[PDB]
Write a protein that binds this DNA or RNA. Structure first.
Ligand SMILES: [Cl-]
Ligand SMILES: [Cl-]
Ligand SMILES: [Cl-]
Ligand SMILES: [Cl-]
Ligand SMILES: [Mg+2]
Ligand SMILES: [Mg+2]
Ligand SMILES: [Mg+2]
Ligand SMILES: [Mg+2]
Ligand SMILES: [Mg+2]
Ligand SMILES: [Mg+2]
Ligand SMILES: [Mg+2]
Ligand SMILES: [Mg+2]
Ligand SMILES: [Mg+2]
Ligand SMILES: [Mg+2]
Ligand SMILES: [Mg+2]
Ligand SMILES: [Mg+2]
Ligand SMILES: [Mg+2]
Ligand SMILES: [Mg+2]
Ligand SMILES: [Mg+2]
Ligand SMILES: [Mg+2]
Ligand SMILES: [Mg+2]
Ligand code: NA
Ligand code: NA
Ligand code: NA
Ligand code: NA
Ligand code: NA
Ligand code: NA
Ligand code: NA
Ligand code: NA
Lengths: 92, 195, 237
RNA sequence: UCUCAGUAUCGGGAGGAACAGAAAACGCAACGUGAUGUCGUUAGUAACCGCGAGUGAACGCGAUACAGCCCAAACCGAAGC
RNA sequence: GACUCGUACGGUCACUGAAUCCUGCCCAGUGCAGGUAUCUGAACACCUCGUACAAGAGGACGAAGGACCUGUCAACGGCG
RNA sequence: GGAGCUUUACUGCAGGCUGUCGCUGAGACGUGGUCGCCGAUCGGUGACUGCGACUCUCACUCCGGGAGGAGGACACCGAUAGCCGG
């Protein structure tokens, strides 16, 4: 489905309607310094690693919309509930 | 002024530098052709020996002991084991090589008790330690106010009970505070969780 | 499963051992002091139960009596020589350096003074090809060209008992008697005729390997069976 | 993985008890405590854990009993055993 | 340490199963083996960023192995 | 519920192959990098190190009764990493 790159809507920061810009959330890089990272290294050993021997996998046929709404006035972003879309394209 | 002893000490801070390095490279050649346990007439590191209680005196004995480097020489499971218990390669013994050396010396000299020991270095495949042992039955020892404690019956076979300095460190008794909850007073009274 | 037969072998139990106590002599070139020769007389020819090939009893000058690996054409009363200066005749042992290129040779040392290693079995020989102050080139019975120290000693001639394998055993009994004189377990049950527990090829409702026979060099014992690290198989191609 | 469990069992060894023990401690942070063991408590608390099932202290406090010392080296240098 | 008081006319590891006449076609998959410009390929050391240090992020280089190429069926097997 | 067996089931563990560190030393070529001193970003010059190519002997290994010989900083062994591994 298609979506406007920009449209007016409520900014929960400004607390008033503003033109927002919408973009797909790009994944941030892991630092590898998180507690879970330390736990993986510490608890892995001879034999099976328990949860750390698991291999993640699987996909729903259609993912939910994953989006940032950024105010063109105050520059801050907010998040919204997503909805299932096989494809999401922006109209500029 | 500096003792002469401080010079032996200082040399041994860096066994791979200077004259000592040359010495080791020569000596080890002879050591590799020697046995498991060799009584030596004089300590290789005199400062360390005296520091540890050695005296030049009747009933004091020094012996150099060779022990293989690395991890447990371990047989693989012959019956069912969960994966955690199936290891061979990475398993290491809980007693350090130094204590192994001390036990082997003490067995060589059944009448003698282990006072202390120290490192004389290593090649790629083995480590050497010199162990100071004491004759508890010799009256030169029995009359020495500094060493006569070792003559008491309750000091019999001290090395095999972990009462040696290397024994005590290896048992986790170094700290009197935090970290010693499961070591002091003994590994066994704490249920074998200390290490 | 259970350890396979090749694994039982290594344990060195009775069934797999050579009957060593029935063996006669460990055949090695006699040691000569240096820069010398030494002579002996052939006193007898006897059977070598480890080799199914004949062996020669020699009585040497210094009084020493020992069996030696006998090339063809050696007989009682013959005089044999061992050393740098020895004559070039069948049965004499010299360093490869002193031997004429193009002469057939046997009981060749791999390293100087090792008593000899190569070309010791019935009828075989090594062919000495090239000389040098550096290297002696020898062609072994397998056809391989072997670079050797010229100080490696060899015996002149081809090993005795040639043609041993020309005659078929014809029957199980004849094999049997030979196998008693060896470090082998015999007869041989096919892996494919065994149960799965007993061999990688075991099992099934009919006899067949049930996996390719060509096995990797890296395969562990108990798995390494069939055609080991084969570069090819079959006849054609 | 975890759990059963550092259990069963095995190897080595001491004593009438053993081990520990006079701080490179604690860290109710202090102008405070003052070797070690044990008992009661702190507490199923902090901490661990397919953060599942389970696992699980310590400091302190109230008690019991209390005990503090010897080398190595410096400086002497055969005065010694 | 067995093989081995042994040395390729030898040992080992497998398949078939005296003699006789014979034993065709297939290397795509799988296995083994060889080669490999290029691609992929870990850790140490090395370079960059980060951190007064460290965690960590990246880079360069590139072993065996793999991709790719070739050999091989009295290899696993196949012959509609 | 159990066991024996199988495999391109899941997860691991031996074993084999291979890089790397230690044992582990001397000389030296090609090249590149972090670099200091002989010069007024410009070049003769320490050391360090990436890189792939080479020679020694002195550890270590094998042969030899020995004298010595063959190897040689490799291999063995210890540690670790990747691949294969019913
Ligand atoms: Cl989206
Ligand atoms: Cl003792
Ligand atoms: Cl045969
Ligand atoms: Cl307090
Ligand atoms: Mg693991
Ligand atoms: Mg006793
Ligand atoms: Mg107690
Ligand atoms: Mg021999
Ligand atoms: Mg035949
Ligand atoms: Mg007959
Ligand atoms: Mg037999
Ligand atoms: Mg058969
Ligand atoms: Mg059957
Ligand atoms: Mg099987
Ligand atoms: Mg059949
Ligand atoms: Mg068949
Ligand atoms: Mg559950
Ligand atoms: Mg527990
Ligand atoms: Mg505490
Ligand atoms: Mg079952
Ligand atoms: Mg299984
Ligand atoms: Na840990
Ligand atoms: Na003793
Ligand atoms: Na512990
Ligand atoms: Na089969
Ligand atoms: Na767990
Ligand atoms: Na094929
Ligand atoms: Na093929
Ligand atoms: Na069963």
């Amino acid at each position: 489905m298609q979506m406007p790159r920009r449209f007016n809507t409520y900014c929960p920061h400004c607390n008033e309607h503003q033109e927002h810009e919408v973009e797909k959330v790009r994944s941030g890089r892991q630092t590898g310094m998180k507690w879970i990272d330390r736990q993986r290294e510490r608890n892995s050993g001879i034999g099976n690693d328990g949860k750390f021997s698991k291999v993640p996998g699987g996909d729903k046929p259609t993912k939910k919309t994953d989006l940032k709404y950024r105010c063109g006035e105050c520059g801050k972003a907010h998040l919204r509930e997503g909805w299932r879309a096989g494809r999401l394209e922006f109209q500029e | 002024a500096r003792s002469a002893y401080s010079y032996i000490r200082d040399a041994w801070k860096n066994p791979g530098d200077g004259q000592l390095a040359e010495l080791q490279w020569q000596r080890q050649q002879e050591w590799r052709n020697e046995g498991a346990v060799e009584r030596i007439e004089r300590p290789t590191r005199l400062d360390k020996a005296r520091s540890q209680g050695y005296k030049a005196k009747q009933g004091v004995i020094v012996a150099r002991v060779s022990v293989r480097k690395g991890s447990a020489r371990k047989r693989r499971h012959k019956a069912g084991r969960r994966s955690k218990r199936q290891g061979v390669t990475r398993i290491t013994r809980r007693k350090d090589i130094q204590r192994v050396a001390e036990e082997r010396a003490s067995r060589t000299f059944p009448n003698l008790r282990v006072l202390n020991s120290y490192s004389v270095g290593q090649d790629g495949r083995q480590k050497w330690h010199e162990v100071i042992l004491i004759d508890p039955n010799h009256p030169a020892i029995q009359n020495d106010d500094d060493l006569s404690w070792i003559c008491a019956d309750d000091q019999a076979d001290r090395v095999f009970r972990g009462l040696t300095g290397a024994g005590r460190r290896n048992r986790g008794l170094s700290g009197k505070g935090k970290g010693s909850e499961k070591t002091r007073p003994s590994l066994r009274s704490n249920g074998g969780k200390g290490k | 499963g259970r350890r396979i037969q090749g694994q039982r072998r290594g344990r060195g139990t009775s069934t797999f051992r050579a009957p060593s106590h029935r063996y006669k002599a460990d055949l090695e070139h006699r040691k000569v002091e240096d820069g010398d020769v030494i002579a002996g007389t052939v006193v007898d020819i006897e059977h070598d139960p480890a080799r199914s090939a004949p062996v020669a009893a020699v009585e040497f000058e210094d009084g020493d009596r020992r069996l030696i690996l006998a090339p063809e054409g050696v007989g009682v009363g013959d005089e044999l020589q061992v050393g740098v200066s020895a004559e070039i005749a069948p049965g004499n042992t010299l360093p490869l350096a002193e031997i004429p290129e193009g002469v057939p040779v046997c009981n060749v040392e791999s390293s100087p003074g090792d008593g000899g290693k190569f070309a010791r079995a019935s009828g075989v020989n090594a062919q000495l090809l090239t000389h040098d102050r550096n290297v002696a080139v020898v062609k072994l019975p397998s056809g391989e060209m072997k670079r050797l120290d010229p100080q490696c000693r060899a015996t002149i001639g081809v090993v005795a008992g040639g043609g041993r394998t020309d005659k078929p055993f014809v029957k199980a009994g004849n094999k049997h008697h030979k196998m008693k004189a060896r470090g082998t377990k015999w007869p041989n049950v096919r892996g494919v005729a065994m149960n799965a527990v007993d061999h990688p090829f075991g099992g099934g409702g009919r006899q067949h390997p049930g996996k390719p026979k060509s096995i990797s060099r890296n395969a562990p014992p108990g798995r390494k069976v069939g055609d080991i690290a084969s570069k090819r198989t079959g006849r054609g191609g």
